[PDB]
């Protein structure tokens, strides 16, 4: 039959979905959550053996354990055990797109248990087992005997053993095929693996049960009553002494109880449910649920007798919560939502796609400290608990379909083709039977990048019409169809227009009031987090919170998706896309996240965290006033401490509660501050502590601050007359500069400073040069290969050009003597073809005090790219273990990626001065610094710069950051001006022009002294 | 793996749907719609044999035929060959309710086919074969080899057999299963039967082919400019030099053309469809596409190489429309439809549920010469040919999806169920693929009586989606749910408000001006026509031209279902259900048509098309106002004959040429008129007549009628002083009156004339009696039954009243001699229980002129429930040819039910005095009689009256028309007053009010004279 292509087959004797169930046979536990003895946990040690197709896998493995079977931990990915290699793959297909046909070499993962079963579990009632995960289609067999199949790697399949068990020893078969025509609906940009890689368990239902309920809470127009309604079906014989009860608890006090037996109202001429029953509780004065406060009830469904026996129990933890969309607004509670999310793919580094709990609460408490409160499960429904634990912590959730074609040309090819509706409804129908309970999840989405066809406006009305409690969206065919609520593009920019044919990207500023457009615009995806990027989120967040309609949006993404590897020494390395022989491959485009795999965060997480801050400040005077984002909670946890400081010298400082109600203001007057002695400039910086742990945070917990220039004094103090003057000694080669202990050296056919001398020991490794060039951030490179060179990008722009090429050619360079100094002047051009691309002018002014100053102006010709940067660099023959300067920091920070960063002294290791992305570039930098000190050394200016033990030219010719060796000495780059990182997307050019080096002209000086 | 009890499987390597193919390898043959070669009919004679479960059949029948198989003709329902017995049986299930199960006994039927294929076939191209129609699913193979399986009874279901076939000789092989999980899907109100009873056909395409296409016509604000699109589909090798050739004709005349490469515009990220191509033609001032006027244009879609070479050719008929919903008006073309509609089942008499071309043309022509323009596929896609025919003969056809779960408790119980969704997706999807480009189609239905589903919104949306030209409806949950764009209640009543609960049936006036409601209102179904009904009709027409918003409906239903059956002695009779031992069942309730199962009109179709007239007149002095109906036609082919008549006798007539616009209106003075010499009521008769034939009727048709009182002259002359006096006789049991040649007969313990005598001869067989009951109709009995008795039917009103029981208590009898005449005066009792129902007080006088004047004057109390009639009943000892009388005619008319009869002078033999309703009950009533005459008889005065040789007593008691016998003499029933028949609906009483005989007091007068 080969069920596994044919879209018409996805399952065979597979029971109807359903909320989570446990079956307690007692109340109490029901209500408590507790572990129900009716669902077992199948988890562990199983058989397993590979095969390179089902043709292969031989009939005795049906009746009995394989001899060439191993033992294995399931759930699990059959890839990270070794048996076969993970490809990983962006859009194009992982095999031959040829539907529903799937290649006759088929991976075939022959999975078995040999388990035992209580007699009390056939004694009577159903037997039932699930597997909530297989990827991606299988069959299975009990004891020999063929039970059923199943398709859609990520949502429940369950299966009726009652009449397949024996008391005893039990034998399960299941045959798990790598592809299937499922494979056409899950083509999620990720790594493509295989097997049972979610739990599998034993339910036990009695024959009379509990099938399926929904809770629902609808409210007055305050808020300040509810009615709870919940819907129960049985399933087994009906009895008139049947009952169903259901009670609504807040902690141990019992809020409603109701109670009734089955039946229905009248729904048509034909009658109403006699298997059916709707219990209405009333609620006054709900403790409503949100992200910010995620108060919740439990609801207890007991099926009972009129005299008082329990049949069974299921529960749910019930969150009172009002979402709607009102006059272009999506509103909770009846407050407009300002999105702060992240899409969120189920990845472990070395698990690969099974998930545990300890991974799911760390990623979660990493979110809310990190000031998200909502999280798209791209690109498909997730593992159960995640919905628990967004319920118990408070983040909002959209909860999507698994079904994504976007290898398909065009495409929509699949989902406006009417043959595959039935396969394209399951995936939707089943996750919203599964989900629906879950207060948490407050948006449903219908999968992603499959485009727009008939078989989305099908299902778009099927969730409207099953269950109007939540919106629909959508992001296939142009982000605003007929098939979604909401406006939710993928990258559309701030201010720029995209307009593609036939799916433009408008500015989200502008596809707001597109004519007749009213509905309100949320980003799925948006600042594609790809190394070092997030350049320009805060042009986001400056348009979330001017425009009402605009209401956030979803961050690409939250983890890198690499996997472990080991090296011939056994040590770990980070790998992607092609490290395991997966060809095609998509290599480093898998990992976009804001954290590394291991969860470790990127520079760029403290950006985001900044920006979506849920407390805005202005300044007055001696006036603060700072202003409540939140919708719902007052400011019961958080008290405002401030400081100001000259040049990073603390001079004053304290701390106020803050009180502070939701969308209110508090004005907090500073003590009058005491003008400073000293010159320099003041600052005053502000941070909101939170005093006490939270259930995400511990004590001390920073959620946001702010910085202020004050006042300035400009210094105005002369110099004392220098003691000695220094010495200039010209050779035919060289122009030597000599003051006391110290030595500086000027070759005159180069003209650069070739070596300088602290007595008599060398300070540099190479020359100080001119730098123009930065090794090619993933923004650079966009989707630019060598056998596809896409023209377009910076990177390639740079290349054309002769940037990385440019040859200095002196033009000057002569020595002059001043009366307490030695002046050094050059004049160097670069050049690729005949073309001169920059010319560098520089004095370098020497004095009796032994401090450098050095001018430089630079001239970039107007037809050439924009170059990447325009500073100095050298190795430093020294290597000391701290950096320590006065400018924005701690962390790396970037032109157009700054805003999280304070000015303030740093000191840092030197290896916090580099970070660890899996692909090398450019990284490490901060701006805005005034003084920076390494070892004897000291630079004064206003520059950018970066320090480590790797050359830009290293970054840029290897590919992993583990096959870095540290150079000798330091490598040292100071720029007067730094490039945009970009980031909007990261397949075409996406720095801002405010933050191009296109000024033509450039100007910035610095002095080296010790 | 018993696919057949499997929802998730409804079918096997199954094609995809498609539009109607043919392959054509000629462009000329395309365009003129002829046969083509490449499209092989596989209909004749094929082996058969019956099995009673698919477990049962031997595997040597896949490899060859069984000796034991009989040759049978294809298509056809086993059923009508006698191998089983067709089951009917209204909403309940045929099999037990278990989804998605269905009985271990499971008729089979093993259909082979030995048949060549030439290797011409085989050498090059795609050879498919093609089921029309298999009830209710099937297996295939093809020379032993398994190819593939599939549902839904309605639809064809298509195979690829390229890789199974050989040059010569070869042999299919299906097994049909009776009942599958699909029959859940099917619970029409029908017989049940199976087999492969649609066509079955081979069709050759080649490998690059035209895989589908669809067309579309835009218009511009007046519709005097349109854009057609075609958006054209191959399968195969996409080569740089394929083209796509669209041309539009008109006749023989090419209005336009357009070439052009495979490559259609950008759709997504991706690109676009490198496989499609959409070409689209200008045409200005298109010949529109109505009812009223089919213009069609044909549509040429050619696929072939650069070079010039042709590949394959496609065509369909393409009919120039606009349907759209605005201001809640459904419009065709701009202008606001008025649908004279009828629900039509593919039912024959003798071929079950096999429909042939003959049939369907006489079905379309006595549709159109009976004014209706409107069709409703009630309740599944019908046989290809209908929408050809209805695209070119003109008729607006309503396409239902086959899937109707009326059984289930509740009725949306899968409806509703997600699991259910692909299985009624493919039934929805498949309709629409197959006939999205007839033009005669201008509304999609989600099926019918299924509740309302999740699955009907998700349906509903999808089919607005792929094809937003059309309107869709669906009546399920109330009418008016979120997945109808149109309000089309069942049986919904004018006036009277149904609230059942969650389902109500509005009035259909008040449910318009409901809170927000703004949807056209088209009832699905409406005047239930079972039997002796259609009473109220002219309530809804006259409602429907008052309100723009109710738009009409279609009724219920077009054909009685009923089956023949032959007797011992070889003679046929119409069955209905159990008449084939199939049990359970809801016997006469499949026969409700307008016609009966033979195509011949019950009396009620002459009401519809009076009713459905496109013409309306109004009368002022001399002047007759003609207004049109008609939306684009002017009425180029119709005349106005008018006539005026005193009492029947012709004084003047002639005929005026109608000249009116769509809409429009057109004056004509009747010329001066010259005054009637005797007294009596003069007449006006107009009506409108098609001097020319068309294609659905013939030269002379008359298409509307009206008639109008005009001047009357009251008698005020008395009759010439009689010669002879009336002589009276008085015995102790009886009152004889004498006078010349005739004698009447009272007896004094009765009360009643029980003989009258012309020479020696005796009058009567059956004394003359008073007569409060009829047979009751198919609207008195409703759902009651024997073993579930409905007390509120009127049958049960009466039955339990005593009205059938009720005995003359004779309370008055004397006799009095006048100076010129004897006058008799009688008053009797009916009672029951000693309870007084009626008391009819009489007077006889019997005059000189031997004219006998009967007074009658009833009382009714008024708790009894109101009688079905208040006249007399006797049984004449003559049996005469002729029938005439001055009164309301010529068909079977009732008080709610004479609208279409006219007042004249009319001559019937007494044959056509009676009408052969299966189901025998009161019939043949003639109403406003002023004058009957029968043999030697005449009755003077203003009555109702039926005659035949069939008793109301024999009428009453005999199920089935064929049963019947004619009595001695003849059974004369004459009525002063007589109640509505209703049919609004026929399970609850539907009598109007104003139709009952709820007066208390009665009067009326009757002549009885010699002629
Ligand atoms: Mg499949
Ligand atoms: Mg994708
Ligand atoms: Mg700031
Ligand atoms: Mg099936
Ligand atoms: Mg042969
Ligand atoms: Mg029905
Ligand atoms: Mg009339
Ligand atoms: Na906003
Ligand atoms: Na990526
Ligand atoms: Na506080
Ligand atoms: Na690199
Ligand atoms: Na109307
Ligand atoms: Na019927
Ligand atoms: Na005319
Ligand atoms: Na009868």
């Given at each position: 039959r080969?069920?596994w292509?044919?879209?018409?087959?996805t399952?065979?004797?597979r029971?109807?979905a359903?909320p989570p169930?446990a079956?307690?046979?007692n109340?109490e536990?029901?209500?408590?959550?507790?572990?129900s003895?009716?669902?077992r946990?199948?988890?562990?040690?199983?058989?397993?053996?590979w095969?390179?197709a089902?043709e292969?896998?031989p009939?005795?493995w049906?009746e009995c354990?394989?001899?060439?079977?191993d033992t294995?931990?399931?759930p699990?990915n059959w890839?990270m055990?070794?048996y076969?290699?993970?490809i990983?793959?962006?859009?194009?297909?992982?095999?031959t797109?040829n539907?529903p046909?799937?290649?006759?070499?088929n991976?075939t993962g022959?999975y078995?248990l040999?388990?035992?079963?209580?007699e009390?579990?056939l004694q009577?009632?159903?037997?039932?087992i699930?597997?909530?995960?297989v990827?991606?289609?299988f069959h299975?067999?009990?004891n020999?005997?063929?039970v059923?199949?199943?398709?859609?790697?990520?949502?429940?399949?369950?299966?009726?053993?009652?009449?397949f068990?024996r008391?005893?020893e039990?034998?399960l078969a299941?045959m798990?095929?790598?592809?299937?025509?499922?494979?056409?609906?899950?083509?999620?940009?990720?790594?493509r693996?295989?097997?049972?890689?979610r739990?599998?368990?034993?339910?036990?239902?009695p024959?009379?049960?509990?099938s399926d309920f929904?809770?629902?809470t609808?409210?007055?127009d305050?808020f300040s009553?509810?009615?709870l309604?919940?819907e129960?079906?049985?399933c087994?014989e009906?009895?008139?002494?049947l009952?169903?009860?259901?009670s609504?608890?807040?902690?141990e006090?019992?809020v409603?109880?109701?109670?009734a037996?089955?039946?229905?109202?009248?729904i048509?001429?034909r009658g109403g449910?006699?298997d059916?029953?709707?219990?209405?509780?009333?609620v006054?004065?709900?403790?409503?649920?949100?992200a910010?406060?995620?108060?919740?009830?439990r609801?207890?469904?007991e099926?009972h007798?009129?005299d008082?026996?329990?049949?069974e129990?299921?529960?749910?933890?019930?969150?009172?919560?009002e979402?709607?969309i009102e006059?272009?607004?999506?509103?909770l509670?009846?407050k407009?939502?300002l999105?702060?999310?992240?899409?969120?793919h189920?990845?472990?580094?070395?698990?690969?796609?099974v998930m545990?709990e300890q991974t799911?609460?760390?990623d979660?408490?990493?979110?809310?400290?990190?000031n998200?409160?909502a999280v798209?499960?791209?690109h498909?429904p997730?593992?159960?608990?995640?919905?628990?634990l967004?319920?118990?912590?408070?983040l909002?959730?959209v909860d999507?379909?698994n079904?994504?074609?976007h290898?398909?040309?065009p495409?929509?090819?699949?989902t406006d083709?009417p043959?595959?509706l039935?396969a394209?409804?399951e995936r939707?129908?089943?996750?919203?039977?599964?989900?629906?309970?879950?207060?948490?999840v407050?948006?449903?989405?219908?999968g992603n990048?499959?485009?727009?066809?008939?078989?989305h406006?099908?299902?778009?009305?099927?969730?409207?019409?099953?269950?109007?409690?939540?919106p629909?969206?959508?992001e296939?065919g142009?982000?605003?169809?007929?098939?979604?609520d909401?406006?939710?593009?993928?990258?559309?920019?701030?201010?720029?227009?995209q307009p593609?044919?036939?799916?433009?990207?408008?500015?989200i500023?502008?596809?707001?009031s597109?004519?007749?457009e009213?509905?309100?615009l949320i980003?799925?995806?948006?600042?594609?987090?790809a190394?070092?990027?997030?350049?320009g989120?805060?042009?986001?967040?400056?348009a979330?919170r001017?425009?009402?309609?605009?209401?956030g949006?979803?961050?690409w993404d939250?983890?890198?998706?690499?996997?472990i590897?080991?090296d011939?020494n056994?040590?770990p390395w980070?790998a992607?896309?092609?490290?395991?022989?997966?060809?095609?491959?998509d290599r480093?485009?898998?990992?976009?996240?804001?954290?590394?795999?291991?969860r470790?965060?990127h520079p760029?997480?403290?950006?985001?965290?900044?920006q979506?801050q849920?407390?805005q400040?202005?300044l007055?005077?001696q006036?603060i006033e700072?202003?409540?984002?939140?919708l719902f909670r007052?400011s019961?946890?958080?008290?405002?401490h401030?400081?100001?400081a000259?040049?990073?010298k603390?001079?004053?400082?304290?701390?106020?509660?803050?009180?502070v109600?939701?969308?209110?203001?508090?004005?907090?007057?500073l003590?009058?501050l005491?003008?400073p002695?000293?010159?320099?400039?003041?600052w005053?910086?502000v941070?909101?502590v939170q005093p006490?742990?939270?259930?995400?945070?511990?004590?001390g917990?920073?959620?946001?601050?702010q910085?202020?220039?004050?006042?300035?004094?400009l210094?105005?103090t002369?110099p004392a007359a220098?003691?000695a003057?220094?010495?200039?000694?010209?050779?035919?080669?060289?122009?030597c500069?000599?003051l006391?202990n110290k030595?500086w050296?000027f070759?005159r056919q180069?003209?650069?400073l070739?070596?300088?001398w602290?007595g008599?020991?060398?300070?540099?490794?190479t020359?100080?040069?001119?730098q123009?060039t930065?090794a090619?951030?993933?923004?650079?490179?966009?989707?630019?290969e060598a056998t596809?060179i896409?023209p377009?990008?910076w990177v390639?722009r740079?290349?054309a050009?002769g940037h990385?090429q440019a040859?200095?050619?002196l033009l000057?360079?002569?020595?002059?003597?001043?009366?307490?100094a030695?002046?050094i002047?050059?004049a160097?051009a670069?050049?690729?073809?005949?073309?001169?691309?920059f010319?560098?002018r520089?004095?370098?002014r020497?004095?009796?005090?032994?401090?450098?100053?050095?001018?430089?102006?630079?001239?970039?010709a107007?037809?050439?790219?924009?170059?990447?940067?325009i500073?100095?660099?050298?190795?430093?023959a020294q290597?000391?273990?701290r950096?320590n300067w006065?400018?924005?920091g701690?962390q790396e920070?970037?032109?157009?990626?700054?805003?999280?960063a304070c000015?303030?002294?740093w000191?840092?290791?030197l290896?916090?001065m580099?970070?660890?992305?899996?692909?090398?570039?450019?990284?490490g930098?901060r701006?805005?610094?005034?003084?920076?000190?390494y070892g004897?050394h000291?630079?004064?200016?206003?520059f950018?710069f970066n320090?480590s033990?790797?050359?830009q030219?290293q970054?840029?010719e290897?590919?992993?950051?583990?096959?870095l060796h540290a150079?000798?000495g330091?490598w040292?780059?100071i720029?007067?001006?730094?490039?945009?990182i970009?980031?909007?997307?990261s397949?075409?050019?996406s720095?801002?022009?405010e933050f191009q080096?296109?000024?033509?002209?450039?100007?910035?000086?610095?002095?080296?002294?010790?």
């Amino acid at each position: 039959r080969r069920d596994w292509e044919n879209p018409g087959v996805t399952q065979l004797n597979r029971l109807a979905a359903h909320p989570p169930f446990a079956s307690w046979r007692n109340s109490e536990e029901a209500r408590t959550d507790r572990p129900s003895q009716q669902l077992r946990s199948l988890n562990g040690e199983w058989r397993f053996a590979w095969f390179p197709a089902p043709e292969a896998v031989p009939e005795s493995w049906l009746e009995c354990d394989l001899p060439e079977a191993d033992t294995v931990v399931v759930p699990s990915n059959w890839q990270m055990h070794g048996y076969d290699a993970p490809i990983y793959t962006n859009v194009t297909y992982p095999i031959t797109v040829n539907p529903p046909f799937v290649p006759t070499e088929n991976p075939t993962g022959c999975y078995s248990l040999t388990f035992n079963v209580d007699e009390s579990w056939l004694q009577e009632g159903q037997t039932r087992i699930i597997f909530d995960g297989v990827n991606s289609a299988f069959h299975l067999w009990c004891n020999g005997r063929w039970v059923g199949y199943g398709q859609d790697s990520r949502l429940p399949s369950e299966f009726d053993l009652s009449a397949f068990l024996r008391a005893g020893e039990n034998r399960l078969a299941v045959m798990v095929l790598r592809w299937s025509d499922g494979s056409y609906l899950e083509d999620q940009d990720m790594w493509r693996m295989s097997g049972i890689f979610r739990d599998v368990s034993l339910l036990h239902k009695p024959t009379t049960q509990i099938s399926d309920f929904h809770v629902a809470t609808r409210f007055n127009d305050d808020f300040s009553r509810a009615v709870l309604e919940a819907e129960v079906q049985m399933c087994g014989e009906l009895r008139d002494y049947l009952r169903v009860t259901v009670s609504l608890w807040q902690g141990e006090t019992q809020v409603a109880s109701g109670t009734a037996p089955f039946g229905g109202e009248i729904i048509d001429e034909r009658g109403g449910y006699a298997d059916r029953v709707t219990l209405r509780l009333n609620v006054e004065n709900p403790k409503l649920w949100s992200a910010e406060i995620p108060n919740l009830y439990r609801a207890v469904v007991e099926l009972h007798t009129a005299d008082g026996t329990l049949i069974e129990a299921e529960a749910c933890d019930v969150g009172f919560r009002e979402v709607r969309i009102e006059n272009g607004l999506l509103l909770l509670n009846g407050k407009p939502l300002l999105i702060r999310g992240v899409n969120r793919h189920e990845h472990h580094p070395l698990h690969g796609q099974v998930m545990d709990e300890q991974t799911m609460v760390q990623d979660i408490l990493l979110m809310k400290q990190n000031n998200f409160n909502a999280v798209r499960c791209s690109h498909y429904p997730n593992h159960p608990l995640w919905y628990t634990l967004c319920d118990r912590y408070g983040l909002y959730v959209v909860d999507e379909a698994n079904i994504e074609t976007h290898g398909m040309v065009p495409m929509n090819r699949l989902t406006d083709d009417p043959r595959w509706l039935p396969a394209m409804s399951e995936r939707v129908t089943r996750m919203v039977q599964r989900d629906r309970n879950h207060p948490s999840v407050i948006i449903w989405s219908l999968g992603n990048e499959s485009g727009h066809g008939a078989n989305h406006d099908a299902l778009y009305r099927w969730i409207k019409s099953v269950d109007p409690s939540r919106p629909v969206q959508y992001e296939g065919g142009g982000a605003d169809t007929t098939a979604t609520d909401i406006i939710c593009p993928m990258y559309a920019r701030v201010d720029e227009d995209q307009p593609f044919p036939a799916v433009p990207k408008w500015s989200i500023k502008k596809w707001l009031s597109l004519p007749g457009e009213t509905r309100p615009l949320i980003l799925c995806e948006y600042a594609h987090a790809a190394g070092n990027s997030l350049g320009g989120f805060a042009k986001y967040w400056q348009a979330f919170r001017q425009y009402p309609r605009l209401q956030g949006g979803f961050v690409w993404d939250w983890v890198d998706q690499s996997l472990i590897k080991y090296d011939e020494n056994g040590n770990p390395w980070s790998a992607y896309g092609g490290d395991f022989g997966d060809t095609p491959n998509d290599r480093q485009f898998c990992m976009n996240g804001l954290v590394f795999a291991d969860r470790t965060p990127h520079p760029a997480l403290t950006e985001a965290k900044h920006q979506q801050q849920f407390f805005q400040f202005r300044l007055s005077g001696q006036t603060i006033e700072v202003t409540s984002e939140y919708l719902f909670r007052h400011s019961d946890n958080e008290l405002l401490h401030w400081m100001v400081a000259l040049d990073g010298k603390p001079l004053a400082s304290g701390e106020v509660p803050l009180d502070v109600a939701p969308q209110g203001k508090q004005l907090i007057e500073l003590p009058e501050l005491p003008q400073p002695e000293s010159a320099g400039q003041l600052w005053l910086t502000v941070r909101v502590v939170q005093p006490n742990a939270t259930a995400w945070s511990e004590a001390g917990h920073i959620s946001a601050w702010q910085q202020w220039r004050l006042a300035e004094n400009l210094s105005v103090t002369l110099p004392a007359a220098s003691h000695a003057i220094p010495h200039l000694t010209t050779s035919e080669m060289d122009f030597c500069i000599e003051l006391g202990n110290k030595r500086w050296q000027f070759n005159r056919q180069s003209g650069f400073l070739s070596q300088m001398w602290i007595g008599d020991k060398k300070q540099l490794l190479t020359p100080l040069r001119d730098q123009f060039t930065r090794a090619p951030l993933d923004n650079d490179i966009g989707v630019s290969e060598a056998t596809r060179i896409d023209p377009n990008a910076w990177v390639e722009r740079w290349k054309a050009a002769g940037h990385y090429q440019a040859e200095a050619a002196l033009l000057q360079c002569t020595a002059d003597t001043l009366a307490d100094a030695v002046l050094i002047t050059t004049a160097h051009a670069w050049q690729h073809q005949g073309k001169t691309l920059f010319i560098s002018r520089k004095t370098y002014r020497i004095d009796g005090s032994g401090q450098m100053a050095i001018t430089v102006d630079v001239e970039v010709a107007s037809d050439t790219p924009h170059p990447a940067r325009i500073g100095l660099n050298c190795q430093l023959a020294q290597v000391a273990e701290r950096v320590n300067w006065l400018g924005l920091g701690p962390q790396e920070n970037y032109p157009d990626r700054l805003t999280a960063a304070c000015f303030d002294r740093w000191d840092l290791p030197l290896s916090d001065m580099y970070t660890p992305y899996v692909f090398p570039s450019e990284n490490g930098l901060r701006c805005g610094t005034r003084e920076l000190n390494y070892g004897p050394h000291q630079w004064r200016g206003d520059f950018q710069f970066n320090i480590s033990r790797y050359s830009q030219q290293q970054l840029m010719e290897t590919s992993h950051r583990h096959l870095l060796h540290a150079e000798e000495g330091t490598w040292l780059n100071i720029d007067g001006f730094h490039m945009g990182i970009g980031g909007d997307d990261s397949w075409s050019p996406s720095v801002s022009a405010e933050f191009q080096l296109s000024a033509g002209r450039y100007h910035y000086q610095l002095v080296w002294c010790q």
